[PDB]
From a paper:
IN first catalyses 3′-processing of the vDNA ends, exposing reactive 3′ OH nucleophile groups that it uses to attack a pair of phosphodiester bonds within target DNA (tDNA), resulting in strand transfer. In this work, we determine the three-dimensional structure of the deltaretroviral intasome and characterize its interactions with its host factor, the PP2A-B56γ subunit. The deltaretroviral IN host cofactor B56γ14, as part of the heterotrimeric protein phosphatase 2A (PP2A) holoenzyme, interacts with a number of chromatin-associated proteins and potently stimulates concerted integration activity of deltaretroviral INs14.
To aid stable intasome formation without altering IN, we constructed a LEDGF/ΔIBD-B56γ chimera containing the DNA-binding region of LEDGF (residues 1–324) and B56γ (residues 11–380). Merging the data allowed us to refine an isotropic 3D reconstruction to an overall resolution of 3.37 Å and 2.9 Å throughout the conserved intasome core (CIC) region. The STLV-1 intasome structure revealed a tetrameric assembly of IN subunits organised around the vDNA ends, with all domains of the tetramer resolved in the cryo-EM map. Flanking two sides of the intasome are two B56γ subunits, which resemble epaulettes. The LEDGF-derived portions of the chimeric host factor construct are not visible in the cryo-EM reconstruction. All four SLiM regions in the IN tetramer participate in host factor binding, creating two distinct binding sites for each of the two intasome-recruited B56γ subunits. The cryo-EM structure revealed an additional novel binding site on B56γ, accommodating the inner IN CCD-CTD linker that runs along the width of B56γ and involves B56γ residues Glu78, Thr81, His82 and Arg143. Thus, the virus uses a remarkable strategy, exploiting the oligomeric assembly of the intasome, to bind a host factor at two separate sites by means of the same intrinsically disordered yet highly conserved region, located on neighbouring IN protomers. In the cryo-EM map, the STLV-1 IN CCD-CTD linker exists in an extended coil conformation providing ample scope for synaptic CTD positioning in cis. Thus, although four IN/CTD domains are resolved in the STLV-1 intasome structure, unlike in several other known intasome structures, they remain monomeric.
Residue numbers in the entry:
A (entry chain D), E (entry chain A): 3 to 39, 52 to 148, 157 to 280
B (entry chain F), F (entry chain C): 27 to 112, 124 to 333
C (entry chain E), D (entry chain B): 3 to 280
DNA sequence: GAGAGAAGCGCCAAACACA
DNA sequence: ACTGTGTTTGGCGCTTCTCTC
DNA sequence: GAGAGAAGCGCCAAACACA
DNA sequence: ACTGTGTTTGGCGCTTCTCTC
């Protein structure tokens, strides 16, 4: 439900339009809530930018490490209790686990990002590291969302809040220019190249002998064609009326009938 | 009527035909937001069930099916564009149009689709009407048009140079006559995907294309919105032959705004990649004039 | 006579024909004896397969695992998608409902929101805090049969793969930190490695064009029941129990009254067909 | 580059071709890495088969088994012939060398005199009394590898069969005495039941015309050695050990130096092929 | 060696002739040792005769139960510390485990052999039991052999001695009339019947695909013929030069080539 | 010479031939216990290796092999019998003879042996000479002869009635002319094995056989040694037809020694089984005379 | 000059362990 | 609903290539 | 009267447990 | 030398027989 969805994440209105909520229902819910009232890269994972941030807590402090993709804006953030080159390396690796491997990384000078530890981390992955001294918008977005989440519930362990904020700004908020989420824009496949003076052919899938789950039979019944494939299954039309997902233990490759 | 699957196979295709003709009836959402809700829901359900049925069974497409679906697409999609108003405006008829787009994409990419039956049903008029749609004010429609035109240009072999010349004409018209166009990024992405697939040595038509319609596209005011696609196209183009880079350099060293402006960052970023790729294999022909004009 | 010879010695089939009997009659004599079927550990039942999603982020399986590193016993919480196979994993210090909630939210931030999650009947997955957390996100939570560790085959196999990769890493750098190793393992598994049979990475499947819709399903089950020798899944024994009659039976299990007061669900691996006494 | 990518992440094969590499080169890169072969529990070695006689009363296998009956723990001593499969078995109160000698003499009186007997390395089969008894009859006594319970597969399978028959008997008459049950089981097994694949009873094979003579044999073994990852048969572990070089190797095992001071015999089930470092 | 063989079992001379010993060596060994110096049935296991015997020990007594086959003389004996119908049943079953199932059993009247327990044991096995009141030779043979074995070693547990005596008189002593041991005469197969006006054919054995042990191959190499068969093996001529025993796990049945 | 297996296959059979001719040389053990020990050991080793080789390889027997092995058997076995002396006497030439017997048995029972090639190499003279051997004073030789004649009579179809008539003549000669014969138990066992294989209804020749040569065999003095085989033959015979038992009863009720003698137990034991089998299906025709003569 | 050895490449059944 | 699975590894066929008579 | 259902019979791969 | 195996069990093809149009 859009009401609960906003009461939990404080997402935007164009996001709620995607769900059961409609334009005027979204406009009603948005301001009925109290607390609510260029690109340099060329491809996804081409250039990143890495900042740091002090997030003020009433009895302590948090050090946020934030990386942003300069083609979609995909945010990856981690919270630490101190800041060294070890934790910069930890943040970069935790980001690589989420988004992928960047080709070029750019960050500000400092005690970290400038030692030999960080350069040795960046040289084992073939990531070139350029340093410059004087994006800051997404940092503020993430900070305001943290503020809201803490405002509604004060007993949050700071680990749930960061994950919920990352979920909101990566999978829920819709960008205004292209009507795409950051995740959707960041992971949508590119267009395949086109061989010249060569017809671009359709791919032909393989043929399988199959058996029906839950039957205990011992006879492979006819070679068919696989429509769709996934991990640990395959969509096989057992008849010309219905199609079933057959696991890999009940499938055997064959050769075209000719 | 009926569900398309719950009938005996003999007449099954026949019912499909009727379903298509049950979707060619128009319903206008902009005329008033509440009108013929039952018929609109029927159309939506029919489109959803047909797109579901077309991607689970093989050998459903037959000869008397192509022109009917082509006509259905031409009736639902080919239309006059809404009045212009420069967050962007969104088409109010988007549900049914999205369903039609997904249907056409799933149909064109079926493994049973034969690439020799639309040479008498999809001709230059189809390409013209589908290419005049890239001026839509809605980005989702532009994305669908891009991913459809890519499949069309890939599958067909007699419409390639025709589409290239038409795109050249579109580029000329936009750069010179009228400056009101919003699909210059999806077209550029398609162009880059096409450019990456060349062979050696490069044909001269491609050199004319690069020198006449890609480089001058820099001198427009609204280059900032679609700079990434253009830069990607240029860097992807000049890899096939490393000698044909000098004209690009001496053309980029002119359209540079010789005054102070916020538009400099685009030129610096593009020059960064062009210089990164050009450095190998003795490139010092224009390095001195490049750095001279850069110091300014 | 065959029947009294078997009633005395419990000989086989090829012995009862050599004393006067048709082959089918000896087969019936053997298939009817209850002392010879109560004690033979050999049976023949169909094989069951776990439930899998029809599209990404439909069904998830979750688990916890121990890892002994530098005199510390880390708890790895693992959540794996069933359609594509994408994995998410975080290391905690101990097991509690708060740790489960935080790990689930990590997983949601990394992969997306799932419709259904099914885990075992642990002491931290059935708690009221976890139930309230799941209901706060509109996520259905079912469980498995207690003491059947093969109903979570995918997530257990994934625990094995993850620990194997971690051991390969720690073989080279015995001073490598834990979070770095877990992050490198997750990157390797999700992005670099290729699945064996479909030949695509887990990421390519997770972010494939969702355009193919869900095939329709059918909740129709089999309308007849039979008699079954059974074993209680928790404790293993020499001889079968029963026979009894099934109340109902779905694909992969059956409802057998273990006692007279209460029934129980038994998989198709601790059941053996019996003969109808009437 | 493939080699540094694998040296960092330990990715698979289908990943190294997608970064620039021939298939054979990626195969070599994987087959050379020692951290990926030390940790993968999957191996591929030939299967071994026990030694069998060339004619009846040539080789015997012996064993003991527990049986819980009426609060008493009987010790069944079992001796089985390898050519025909004929069994002999006696029930005793406890295990000692005197019991072993008496059981062996029972077996000899029932079946005949064997040339060779091979049993495990128990505390009552290696004693001086048993050795003197065996030498008094001109019977060779060899042993197996310690902690390899599958080298006496025939006699263990026979223990299973014998206990299954005993349980079938005690299901009917829970007051039946022990010697009567053992005698009925022995009669059933030796005289009434038919072997599965040859379709003759054990007795018909044991007392067949010995006219077919012994085929000649050959003690020629393989003349080359290789390198092996190994596991010590007693204790199981996660990762392999080694590699090392074999001193010699006969069909079914190999001689591997477990330590620097002493060597050991390891079967073809705890060995994994390694690459030659030179 | 014949010397040790006699020093252990005190077997006969015609027995030692079968081994390495020759006629005059057997005659020398026989009297160089100190302590040494009709048929009613029609087929093996047709009629038995069962006796009982007190064997006198210097501090106790043994009750020997002895059954003898009245066509070969095969002895089966058991020693007990008392005598009841339970122990008569135990003796009969222990004999059945050794020799086979008799068709007709004959024994003397007494407290046992005449109760309902023994008749109920004999009626569940289809063995008819005839009782008569007044062979005794084999009993004396077995008793004298027990005496000899005790004479040589006094510390025998009476369980080894009985087994050694049974081994000697069943598998070692050669009968004088037919030059056969009791075991050999008792277990040699009878002649198969002969169909009239029908050629008695040779049995044709089956054909197998096989693999070589210790090679790890995955290809069945040619259908051959099995010469001999046993439990858990089969004699297969891999070539026309040598033949090997292939286990059953490496054999697969086939059909004649035609 | 050489081992038979270590030669190339082409000439392999040839060597086998020579080996057979290396076994036809005679060595006499009764002439003196120590003579030509080396040659005797060579003969024994050759026989052992040949019998080992003949039972492990298929398609070794060929056409030019049958008469040679027949001649070898006829040379080693067919001979005059030793002088009679009434523990029994044992042949001193037993090793080589046992080897020859085992060789012949393994050869005749090979699966490659063809039952149509010895119809021109094994004729009535072979049967006569092999059947005159049942008077041997050694029991092992008699056992081997029995188990060989069984295989011969089973495999061949033209020598059956001939062997039966010859056995009838042997029985007549033993019962009447000469009483010195020691093979009347193995012959009776073979006869019983033959008798069990009849069909219905019984031929009249078999009735003549039973009434003329089986029943009178009772009146001999030395019936006690071979009583079991005779009784088994009678009881096995009369099962095929239950009506043809009365002549057996009225013939056994005459040859009974009407005086006191130790020979009564045989007649009582046989009458026990005959009465056990005859009782079903209304048998009281001769019960009164049987019991009358039995009371005596 | 040509037909045979040699290397590359895909595919598959049997094991194995996480619980 | 309740329900085992994914990866490794030598062998083997099948296609392409190169060194010798 | 004839061709199809029905019962008999052999054969085989996958499990299982003794340690 | 050193070394896993034998039995059970439903399904399935293949041969023989019987009840109906
Ligand atoms: Zn809000
Ligand atoms: Zn039973
Ligand atoms: Zn590695
Ligand atoms: Zn002595």
């Amino acid at each position: 439900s859009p009401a609960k969805l906003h009461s939990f994440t404080h997402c935007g209105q164009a996001a709620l339009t995607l769900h059961g909520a409609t334009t005027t229902e979204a406009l009603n819910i948005l301001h009925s809530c109290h607390a609510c009232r260029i690109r340099r890269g060329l491809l996804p994972n081409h250039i990143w930018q890495g900042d740091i941030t002090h997030f003020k807590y009433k009895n302590t402090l948090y050090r946020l490490h934030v990386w942003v993709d300069t083609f979609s804006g995909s945010v990856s953030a981690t919270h630490k209790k101190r800041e060294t080159s070890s934790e910069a390396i930890s943040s970069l690796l935790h980001a690589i686990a989420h988004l992928g491997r960047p080709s070029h990384i750019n960050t500000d000078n400092g005690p970290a990002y400038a030692s030999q530890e960080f350069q040795h981390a960046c040289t084992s992955l073939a990531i070139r590291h350029t340093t410059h001294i004087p994006v800051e918008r997404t940092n503020g977005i993430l900070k305001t969302l943290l503020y809201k989440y803490f405002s509604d519930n004060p007993n949050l362990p700071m680990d749930n809040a960061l994950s919920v904020a990352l979920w909101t700004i990566n999978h829920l908020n819709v960008l205004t220019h292209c009507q795409k989420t950051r995740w959707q824009l960041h992971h949508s496949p590119r267009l395949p190249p086109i061989p010249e003076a060569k017809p671009v052919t359709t791919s032909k899938t393989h043929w399988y002998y199959f058996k029906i789950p839950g039957l205990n039979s011992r006879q492979w019944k006819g070679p068919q064609r696989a429509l769709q494939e996934a991990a640990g299954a395959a969509l096989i039309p057992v008849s010309d009326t219905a199609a079933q997902w057959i696991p890999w233990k009940l499938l055997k490759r064959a050769v075209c009938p000719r | 009527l009926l569900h398309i699957r719950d009938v005996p196979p003999a007449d099954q295709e026949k019912l499909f035909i009727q379903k298509l003709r049950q979707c060619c009836v128009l319903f206008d959402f902009v005329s008033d937001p509440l009108s013929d809700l039952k018929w609109k829901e029927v159309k939506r359900a029919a489109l959803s069930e047909m797109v579901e049925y077309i991607t689970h069974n093989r050998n459903v497409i037959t000869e008397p099916i192509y022109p009917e679906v082509v006509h259905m697409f031409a009736v639902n999609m080919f239309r006059t564009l809404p009045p212009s108003s420069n967050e962007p405006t969104l088409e109010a008829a988007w549900p049914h149009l999205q369903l039609v787009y997904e249907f056409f994409l799933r149909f064109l990419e079926s493994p049973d689709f034969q690439p020799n039956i639309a040479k008498k049903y999809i001709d230059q008029k189809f390409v013209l009407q589908l290419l005049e749609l890239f001026d839509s004010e809605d980005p989702r429609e532009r994305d669908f048009l891009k991913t459809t035109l890519h499949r069309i240009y890939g599958k067909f072999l007699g419409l390639r140079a025709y589409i290239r010349k038409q795109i050249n004409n579109i580029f000329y018209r936009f750069i010179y006559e009228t400056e009101h166009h919003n699909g210059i990024a999806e077209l550029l992405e398609i162009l880059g995907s096409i450019i990456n697939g060349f062979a050696l040595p490069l044909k001269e038509e491609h050199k004319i294309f690069l020198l006449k319609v890609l480089l001058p596209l820099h001198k427009v005011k609204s280059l900032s919105v679609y700079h990434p696609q253009l830069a990607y196209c240029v860097v992807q183009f000049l890899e096939k032959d490393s000698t044909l880079t000098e004209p690009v350099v001496m053309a980029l060293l002119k359209y540079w705004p010789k005054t102070h402006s916020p538009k400099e960052v685009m030129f610096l970023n593009e020059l960064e990649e062009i210089l990164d790729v050009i450095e190998p294999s003795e490139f010092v022909k224009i390095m001195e004039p490049l750095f001279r004009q850069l110091a300014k």
